[PDB]
Design a protein around this ligand. Structure first.
Ligand SMILES: [Ca+2]
Lengths: 49, 49
């Protein structure tokens, strides 16, 4: 009578949500406060973070 | 008188009910919980059962 269609199934799901990286920024204001930059001046400025 | 029609019978029956196999499935959610998948990421996921 019944000629079974021999076909069973298995399934799965994958969730890719985020991007690998977050670039958190703290911008710099290099002449800063309690220091001074002059025209034609020479030197170095550094922000560690 | 009676000319016996010499024909006796034997019979039998066979019961084919089930299909050979049962594919029980536990689907996978591969990023899972307490783990994370990122875009462009590389690695391995495994489900034992
Ligand atoms: Ca990885």
């Amino acid at each position: 009578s019944v000629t079974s269609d021999r076909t069973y199934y298995g399934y799965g799901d994958v969730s890719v949500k985020n991007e690998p990286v977050n670039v958190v920024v703290s911008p710099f204001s290099f002449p800063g406060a309690n220091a001074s930059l002059s025209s034609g001046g020479q030197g170095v400025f550094k922000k560690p973070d």
